[PDB]
Amino acid sequence: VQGLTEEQRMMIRELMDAQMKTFDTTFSHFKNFRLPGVQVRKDLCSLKVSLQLRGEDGSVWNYKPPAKEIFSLLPHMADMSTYMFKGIISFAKVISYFRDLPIEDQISLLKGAAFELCQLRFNTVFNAETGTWECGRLSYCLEDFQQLLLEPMLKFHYMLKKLQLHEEEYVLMQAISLFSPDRPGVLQHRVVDQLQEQFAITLKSYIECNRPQPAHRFLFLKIMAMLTELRSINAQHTQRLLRIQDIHPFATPLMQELFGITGS
Numbered sequence: 001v002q003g004l005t006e007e008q009r010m011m012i013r014e015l016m017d018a019q020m021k022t023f024d025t026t027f028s029h030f031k032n033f034r035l036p037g038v039q040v041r042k043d044l045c046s047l048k049v050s051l052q053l054r055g056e057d058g059s060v061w062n063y064k065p066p067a068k069e070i071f072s073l074l075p076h077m078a079d080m081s082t083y084m085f086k087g088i089i090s091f092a093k094v095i096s097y098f099r100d101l102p103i104e105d106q107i108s109l110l111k112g113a114a115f116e117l118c119q120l121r122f123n124t125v126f127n128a129e130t131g132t133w134e135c136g137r138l139s140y141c142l143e144d145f146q147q148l149l150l151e152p153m154l155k156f157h158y159m160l161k162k163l164q165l166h167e168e169e170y171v172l173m174q175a176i177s178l179f180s181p182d183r184p185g186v187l188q189h190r191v192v193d194q195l196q197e198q199f200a201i202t203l204k205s206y207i208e209c210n211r212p213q214p215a216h217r218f219l220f221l222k223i224m225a226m227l228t229e230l231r232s233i234n235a236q237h238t239q240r241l242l243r244i245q246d247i248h249p250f251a252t253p254l255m256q257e258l259f260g261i262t263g264s
């Protein structure tokens with residue numbers, strides 16, 4: 001199924017192939033991470049998360065948080081973030097359009113979008129019926145209403161999930177986010193921008209060709225608005241993270257590079 005030009009079909013295929021090669025959807029290789037042991041507030045969410053690890057032998061470990069000092073959870077969160085960031089970096093470097101950019105713009109684009117592409121991937125393993133991100137043998141369950149939807153990042157995941165996007169549309173959202181001409185430090189602003197417009201046109205065109213239903217009217221514009229919201233959620237989270245890092249260091253080396261922390 002198409003309706004697109006051959007160059008548009010190639011673009012989707014190139015993105016789908018990079019996603020296939022760099023997204024471990026069963027989180028098989030996320031191993032030996034840390035776990036909670038046996039203006040700091042006021043800017044953090046009131047959302048609590050419970051953790052579940054299914055054992056290879058069928059046993060289950062379950063973690064419930066106190067019922068809110070979440071410092072015990074940060075090293076684990078830093079390790080999962082780092083694992084997702086590694087996937088995102090591998091995603092970008094397999095795309096020809098990305099490789100073709102100057103090294104400095106690659107770093108600048110990855111610094112801008114790594115959070116955003118990570119969330120887009122986490123949305124594909126989110127279960128909106130049970131409030132759970134299902135990451136292989138690892139589950140993150142939301143702790144007990146619609147008061148949960150007032151945390152903007154949770155609302156993003158629920159709203160994005162309700163759109164019932166195809167694999168192809170998730171991977172085009174990832175490309176539009178990554179090829180953002182107005183990220184800090186971008187030099188080839190015009191090249192990145194024309195790439196972005198092509199990915200966007202392909203998405204608009206894909207939607208027009210393969211989603212005739214009345215429920216998918218304005219779907220392209222809905223997706224664009226969620227990408228705008230994701231970008232704003234990105235700035236909010238970066239600043240929450242740098243505040244905590246200033247009181248309680250937790251960012252991995254890789255997170256430090258992405259957030260421009262230098263070690264001094």
Ligand SMILES: CCCOCCN(C(=O)CCl)c1c(CC)cccc1CC
Pocket residue numbers: 049077078080081084118119122123133140153
């Ligand atoms: C430094 C922790 C940020 O976590 C808040 C953002 N988030 C989610 O909403 C789940 Cl998609 C998420 C979680 C919480 C389950 C764990 C690992 C990775 C991430 C994304 C990077």
